[PDB]
Design a protein around this ligand. Sequence first.
Ligand code: MG
Ligand code: MG
Ligand code: MG
Ligand code: MG
Ligand code: MG
Ligand code: MG
Ligand code: MG
Ligand code: MG
Ligand code: MG
Ligand code: MG
Ligand code: MG
Ligand code: MG
Ligand code: MG
Ligand code: MG
Ligand code: MG
Ligand code: MG
Ligand code: MG
Ligand code: MG
Ligand code: MG
Ligand code: MG
Ligand code: MG
Ligand code: MG
Ligand code: MG
Ligand code: MG
Ligand code: MG
Ligand code: MG
Lengths: 186, 234, 51, 103, 144, 142, 126
Amino acid sequence: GIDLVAGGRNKRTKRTAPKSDDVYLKLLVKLYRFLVRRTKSQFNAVILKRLFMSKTNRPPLSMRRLVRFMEGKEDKIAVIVGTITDDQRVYEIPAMKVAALRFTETARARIVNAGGECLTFDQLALRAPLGQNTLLLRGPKNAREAVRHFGKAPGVPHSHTKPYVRSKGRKFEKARGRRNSRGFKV
Amino acid sequence: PEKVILKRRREEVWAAEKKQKVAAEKIKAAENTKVIYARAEQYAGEYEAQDKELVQLKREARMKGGFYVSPEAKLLFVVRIRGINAMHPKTKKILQLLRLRQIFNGVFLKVNKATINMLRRVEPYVAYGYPNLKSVRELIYKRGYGKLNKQRIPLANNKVIEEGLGKHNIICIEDLVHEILTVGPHFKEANNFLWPFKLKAPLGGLKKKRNHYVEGGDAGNRENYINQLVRRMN
Amino acid sequence: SVVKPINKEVKRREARKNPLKNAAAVLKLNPYFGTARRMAVLAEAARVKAR
Amino acid sequence: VKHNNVIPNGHFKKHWQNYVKTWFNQPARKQRRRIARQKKAVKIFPRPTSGPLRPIVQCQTRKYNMKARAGRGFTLEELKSAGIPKKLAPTIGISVDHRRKNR
Amino acid sequence: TTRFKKNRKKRGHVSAGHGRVGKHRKHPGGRGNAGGMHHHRILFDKYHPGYFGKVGMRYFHKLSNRFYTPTVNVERLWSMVPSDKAAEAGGDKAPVVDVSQFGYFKVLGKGMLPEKPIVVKAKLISKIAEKKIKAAGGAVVLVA
Amino acid sequence: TTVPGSLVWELVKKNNCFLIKQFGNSNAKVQFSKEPNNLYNVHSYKFSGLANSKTVAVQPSAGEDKAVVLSTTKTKKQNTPAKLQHKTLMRKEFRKMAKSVKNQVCDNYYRPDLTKPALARLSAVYRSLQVSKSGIKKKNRQ
Amino acid sequence: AVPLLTRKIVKKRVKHFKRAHSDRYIGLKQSWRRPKGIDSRVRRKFKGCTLMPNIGYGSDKKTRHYLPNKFKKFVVHNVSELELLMMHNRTYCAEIAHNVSTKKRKDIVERAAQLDIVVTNKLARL
RNA sequence: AAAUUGCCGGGAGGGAAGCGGAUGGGGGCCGGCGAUGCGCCCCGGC
RNA sequence: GGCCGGUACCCGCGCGCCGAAAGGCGUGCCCCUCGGGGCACUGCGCUGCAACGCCCUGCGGGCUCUCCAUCCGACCCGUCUUGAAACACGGACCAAGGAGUCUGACAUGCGUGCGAGUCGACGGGUUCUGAAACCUGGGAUGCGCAAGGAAGCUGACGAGC
RNA sequence: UAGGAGGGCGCGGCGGCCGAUGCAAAACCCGGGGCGCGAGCCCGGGCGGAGCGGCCGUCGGUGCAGAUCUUGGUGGUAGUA
Ligand SMILES: [Mg+2]
Ligand SMILES: [Mg+2]
Ligand SMILES: [Mg+2]
Ligand SMILES: [Mg+2]
Ligand SMILES: [Mg+2]
Ligand SMILES: [Mg+2]
Ligand SMILES: [Mg+2]
Ligand SMILES: [Mg+2]
Ligand SMILES: [Mg+2]
Ligand SMILES: [Mg+2]
Ligand SMILES: [Mg+2]
Ligand SMILES: [Mg+2]
Ligand SMILES: [Mg+2]
Ligand SMILES: [Mg+2]
Ligand SMILES: [Mg+2]
Ligand SMILES: [Mg+2]
Ligand SMILES: [Mg+2]
Ligand SMILES: [Mg+2]
Ligand SMILES: [Mg+2]
Ligand SMILES: [Mg+2]
Ligand SMILES: [Mg+2]
Ligand SMILES: [Mg+2]
Ligand SMILES: [Mg+2]
Ligand SMILES: [Mg+2]
Ligand SMILES: [Mg+2]
Ligand SMILES: [Mg+2]
């Protein structure tokens, strides 16, 4: 006998590989296993594990937010393990070089028509095998609608959690527990 | 083909580079063995002097009409003697901190008011005492394993020590012994480096494990008599 | 242009050599052991022949 | 009832399994209507298969008054202004609506 | 897909995953939302505060069409302008956008506008929306 | 292989008309590939006669004595199935045919990969031709 | 015809794991079922009771699925499937499928003769 | 097909039998159950 | 004296001679000063320990199969229970049948497609094994794109650490 | 233990691929040989006399020892009362 928790074995879990059996994403993973293995680029280590990620851990990035993050750094390549979506609320976009897994059709046209480039991750490893002169960006992870419902319960003090309710209006989740005139105010 | 010659040439460069590294290493190995030889002589030298000096000091006091109080012990060897079932939570936690989480595991300790008061709270579970040169040396050679990158690596050679400690100017097993025995400036590092010793069940048996050594059992402090118990579990 | 030297080495655990009573194992651990033995081995010659 | 879920409100407390309407006859409905249209086309040839002429009307109700759609039939004034007699229009392919107004 | 259902992995296990002590019994808590104020009171108060009671006033025969007012912000008015006409302009010459032809009734003021003047022609508008349009140099027109 | 070989291996790895797999998906699985341009009949991308533009075939000919057929496909004819293959009929002696195989598999950098496998398959194919004609003489259990 | 395997095959158990109490009832099948009973002394592993299969009994990965012949088997149905063993003759042995007729078996045996393929049911159906 | 039954042959038994580990005796069965080939050589022909 | 192992590196071998083989044989510096000792420059390659047996279609070899013998172990399963071998219940035996499914709403997770959009799901058109497939509409159908108010109503002027 | 998950085994269809069979398919029988920790699987011999199997994907009325379980058949009781 030896005093250990679960025999000293790891009880946490991480994705050691992607879930999708998508042949091209499988090919990209083989490239970056080789790149992390031989080049030891810390950038390359980040790109590999982000490739092993679910759709909700790789949220999209709008071109408005990307244009803000690139401003003044147009001698570098924006890198997003995810999707670039077009944003109508922007007018000025600089000529910029963006690598991403996907571009929407409107986004890619907007970037190209500015005089930029819509790179893939295979093309990135040609032009930056160690991620040199790159701007590595994520999108807003906690911006989902589901995230509003997370955290402390809707009916506890100081919580601003969104309740699961089937409709809106006065008859749905407003009376007892939501105002002083009906019982109590949460 | 260009890809053919392009590939061979780099391998020639790479193969050329390796021999320079290996040529450099035999030279460093030659320097090291003399350095290691030099260190071991004085370590062997000064232990003999320390033994003779205590004999000398005690003799001088007796002819003066007084007597020499010997230096208080600094190194303990602690061995676990009780199994892992039915343990009190505070006793359980201390033995984890002492790196004793299996019966007949042994580690080396510094004496401290902080340390001695941790052994007082887990004493029924451990036997301990003051190790000597032979016990400290034979434990480390025979049963010494290193903690390299969280892994238990046997100290079959000196390079394991160099890569293990190195920074603290610990280069050989013999200076690793010295660092442990004469508790030195890097005793913390050189004692955490050693993985907990895995000892035999004692050849010849124990007395009643349930009692203190003073009563005739085996628990507690048995100061120099720990060396007799090392011989039988090593 | 950026990869490191390829490594085809397969290094394995090495078998145990008796660290206390194997000549090529003690010496490659503690090179001074040969001298330390011989000193008292030499002194034992003097001690026995003395009487 | 248990964990943070939406309040369940399914209306399945009657003998609902006796009024289940399945749609396995949807492809056959399309064919019968197609044959019906095709058979009707021959019996009215050469008259157009869309039917009689429908006038432009604005839809009701704020949400739709900006959208024009086909109405039931022409008013009496629209018919008389264009000089198409009241009782001749349905006979020549023009629907009538004695109820609609011209405001 | 019955082959991936987990009951197929509990075959040979007595209780089918529902326990030996507390069984799978018929309706041990009551049916549906029974006990919202008695034995599910913590759950209703914790996750659905406001559930019980009467607030506000009734509206006999509510028709949704009467309440229909689609809204667009000013930040989205320039996607509405075609590029060639976004080119045809002077300093004083601005395109005119009838948001009613795009399905919108009111114009709200979220977001920024480019310097180019614009003439927004709407049924309804907010304070800030016209304040931002004027500050770009354009004008607002009311229609019905 | 009008698309790359690495891509094609991805598509045909888990299922194709040549892969005969037996004894389940446990540690008892045995799998072979019976396509004719696979030298060891091994279902791997190294030996795959499907996911490579450059492949070697070593086959005993049809009813005829001592004729080994050696075939190598053509990298640039991938989309012309009929005239993709360059086959050669050799009825010379073994050591002389061991030269022809090296000339077309190794020395031109075609597939330095399959130097050993092609020769070994020639050794086995050629010996099967002797035994077919001469009849069984040895038992080979020693 | 000479097998490659140069290592003795060690089995940690040769007996089967018969089902508990299948010796006491007739309608119980001998195939292994793990007891789930609350008081089952087989499940609780008392000494003197029938044993349960563990991963610890697992045979060396090197000599796994090798027959006493020191070849690993591959069942063939025709001559074509036999010719897949041409280059594996020192590791794999063919075996004709149980429902291959006498006529077809004569062909497989003739062809296996030339390619030097060990066949473990060469005399069946004749 | 099984439960259950008869006949023939074999085996064992002092108030249960069956069972798990060992092995010893009997059976019954296993020829991929277990090899006789490869290298130098001398002819004598292919 | 017991158990394991038998070498693709660690050891070891060839490159010189002697020797059946152990093993020995050279030079120079330091040391005592006997014995002799210690250090020295080091290079190329190579690199699975052996010797004899027994049997060879036998009355041989082994076997995970069957029976039997002996020693050791060994209470009947399922179940509820703090606790079952129970003087707790169910079970004489065998074969076949025999129990978390379908549907609607919602939720989290994961996969796919598109993305400020997204659905063609009621219809229409077309379709010759197809009740399939394929095309079409939507400029506002659902959901999303904006919220706070009981309501009348109003509706995000652009972030720093 | 209660409980959760992963990876497998097995049964029957459907879309595809690869095959066996009157020179004897399925089912069943065996003191036959084997493989796998195991679910199970492969082969031998017999019986039978016309169908069957493996692989990929997908699907389901898909795995029994119990329920005083359902239906059928069969024992001991007993050549007894
Ligand atoms: Mg409060
Ligand atoms: Mg003893
Ligand atoms: Mg005792
Ligand atoms: Mg006690
Ligand atoms: Mg369980
Ligand atoms: Mg459950
Ligand atoms: Mg139950
Ligand atoms: Mg319960
Ligand atoms: Mg209870
Ligand atoms: Mg409950
Ligand atoms: Mg009450
Ligand atoms: Mg219990
Ligand atoms: Mg019977
Ligand atoms: Mg009898
Ligand atoms: Mg027994
Ligand atoms: Mg026996
Ligand atoms: Mg009780
Ligand atoms: Mg009792
Ligand atoms: Mg009861
Ligand atoms: Mg009863
Ligand atoms: Mg059944
Ligand atoms: Mg829409
Ligand atoms: Mg069915
Ligand atoms: Mg069922
Ligand atoms: Mg039954
Ligand atoms: Mg049961």
